[PDB]
Amino acid sequence: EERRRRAAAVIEEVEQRFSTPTALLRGIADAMVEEMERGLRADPHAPLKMLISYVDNLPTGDEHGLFYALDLGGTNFRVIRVQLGGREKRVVSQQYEEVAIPPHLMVGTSMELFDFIAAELESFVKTEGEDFHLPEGRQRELGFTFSFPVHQTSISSGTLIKWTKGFSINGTVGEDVVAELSRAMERQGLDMKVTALVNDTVGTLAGGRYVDNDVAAAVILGTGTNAAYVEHANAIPKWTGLLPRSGNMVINMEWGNFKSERLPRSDYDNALDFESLNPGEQIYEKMISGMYLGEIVRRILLKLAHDASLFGDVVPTKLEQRFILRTPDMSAMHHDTSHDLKHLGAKLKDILGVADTSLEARYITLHVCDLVAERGARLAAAGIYGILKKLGRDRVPSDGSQKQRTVIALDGGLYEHYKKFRTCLEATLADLLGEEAASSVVVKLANDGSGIGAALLAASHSQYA
Numbered sequence: 001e002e003r004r005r006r007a008a009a010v011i012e013e014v015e016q017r018f019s020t021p022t023a024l025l026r027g028i029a030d031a032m033v034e035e036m037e038r039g040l041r042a043d044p045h046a047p048l049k050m051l052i053s054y055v056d057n058l059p060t061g062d063e064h065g066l067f068y069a070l071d072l073g074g075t076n077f078r079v080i081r082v083q084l085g086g087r088e089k090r091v092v093s094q095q096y097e098e099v100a101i102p103p104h105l106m107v108g109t110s111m112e113l114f115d116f117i118a119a120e121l122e123s124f125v126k127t128e129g130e131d132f133h134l135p136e137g138r139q140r141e142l143g144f145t146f147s148f149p150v151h152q153t154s155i156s157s158g159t160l161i162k163w164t165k166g167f168s169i170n171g172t173v174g175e176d177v178v179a180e181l182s183r184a185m186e187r188q189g190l191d192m193k194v195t196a197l198v199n200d201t202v203g204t205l206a207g208g209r210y211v212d213n214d215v216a217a218a219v220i221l222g223t224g225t226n227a228a229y230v231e232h233a234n235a236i237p238k239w240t241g242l243l244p245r246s247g248n249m250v251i252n253m254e255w256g257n258f259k260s261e262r263l264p265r266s267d268y269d270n271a272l273d274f275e276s277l278n279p280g281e282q283i284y285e286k287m288i289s290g291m292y293l294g295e296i297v298r299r300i301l302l303k304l305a306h307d308a309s310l311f312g313d314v315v316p317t318k319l320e321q322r323f324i325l326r327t328p329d330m331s332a333m334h335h336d337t338s339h340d341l342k343h344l345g346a347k348l349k350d351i352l353g354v355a356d357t358s359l360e361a362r363y364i365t366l367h368v369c370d371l372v373a374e375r376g377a378r379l380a381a382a383g384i385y386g387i388l389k390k391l392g393r394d395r396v397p398s399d400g401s402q403k404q405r406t407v408i409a410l411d412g413g414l415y416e417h418y419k420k421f422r423t424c425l426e427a428t429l430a431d432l433l434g435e436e437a438a439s440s441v442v443v444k445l446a447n448d449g450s451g452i453g454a455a456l457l458a459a460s461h462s463q464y465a
């Protein structure tokens with residue numbers, strides 16, 4: 001059919017532009033490290049901000065007391081509460097409540113955002129049961145995870161640099177995010193002090209090390225993507241204070257903003273960025289993250305539907321709608337194994353609004369999902385590889401003796417729930433490492449680990465009382 005060769009040409013340029021041979025991945029990992037060095041010396045125009053987090057001591061286990069945590073949150077926010085027992089007892093009690101963020105609150109007024117989340121924290125502390133005790137006269141203390149880039153000014157204070165992953169609230173850039181929350185808690189008649197402000201990457205790394213001593217980094221793969229790691233404070237040229245007692249510092253790399261001419265981008269990525277909420281920003285994230293994967297698939301399917309009549313001789317109206325194909329929908333289609341792809345086809349009926357689909361159209365769709373998820377997962381593995389190279393963990397002992405154990409905590413709905421994405425991520429990372437080096441790296445799932453991690457860092461920075 002002519003329509004068949006016209007479809008093969010589209011799929012062929014997708015394969016060509018999206019191609020990520022291991023050799024290219026090593027050059028991208030090298031460029032990541034190059035960019036990490038630029039951000040640590042405060043280079044102008046550095047894509048990676050490499051933010052000092054003021055976390056110089058990760059949790060040890062001896063944390064004790066009662067502490068709350070507020071976790072925000074690209075798609076949801078959760079309020080957490082733990083009773084910490086100490087090196088031997090640990091988390092005696094724990095309670096949490098997760099709430100989905102209404103879509104308007106991502107793009108409205110900052111007072112509406114913080115009023116909404118502070119009101120849910122209010123009704124949450126009001127149900128504080130008897131398993132959690134607060135000594136008399138004392139003030140309840142909070143750990144605040146703020147999943148957006150913040151120029152840190154103390155362990156508990158920081159300026160919003162910019163919004164990401166679907167958020168766009170005027171009037172917060174430049175403002176202290178902890179003061180903005182503190183005011184909202186006050187308007188709710190709520191006695192709490194924020195004693196720790198962390199990015200969700202820094203929090204997951206805190207929560208990860210609390211249960212595994214070898215956690216060296218945290219990678220987030222959810223609605224957005226980002227990563228944090230532990231750096232040597234004497235390896236940060238832009239550091240100007242004293243130097244931490246522990247010689248360590250957690251860095252929020254903000255690696256979604258990574259950009260490199262080595263990144264295999266296409267016209268679909270240019271169009272996606274052009275019509276986005278933050279054009280020109282977060283180039284790397286827009287190839288990896290959950291908010292954008294399904295949208296890349298939709299734009300490829302649209303090209304096919306138009307240039308090859310893939311879904312009929314009239315392009316389906318719904319297919320032209322932006323973000324109509326969410327990434328969990330992409331994930332559902334991708335995992336269909338039935339001989340006729342009946343579940344991929346059932347999903348396509350909802351999302352496209354068509355009555356039916358060719359078996360051949362279903363296999364093309366499955367192939368597109370495959371190419372988009374594969375490129376995102378391989379590039380994310382290249383980023384993790386770059387971190388390991390920064391910590392000198394890409395290689396094993398030369399003296400031939402003593403393999404280290406390096407743990408990387410992973411968090412986010414993409415990694416947790418997109419099976420093909422996760423296994424492609426881990427396979428490529430193991431490929432990038434040697435067979436010798438890979439047996440020393442652990443990818444641990446620490447989902448929503450910034451909740452307890454923010455509570456732990458609020459603990460070690462209490463007032464007290």
Ligand SMILES: Nc1ncnc2c1ncn2[C@@H]1O[C@H](COP(=O)(O)OP(=O)(O)O)[C@@H](O)[C@H]1O
Nearest residue numbers: 073074075222223290328331412413414417418
């Ligand atoms: N089944 C799935 N398949 C693919 N991606 C998913 C799936 N479930 C969730 N996700 C992605 O993970 C995100 C939710 O992850 P989570 O870390 O809880 O929130 P956020 O990253 O928004 O703070 C969603 O926005 C979605 O992009």
Ligand SMILES: [Mg+2]
Nearest residue numbers: 076412413448
């Ligand atoms: Mg979640």
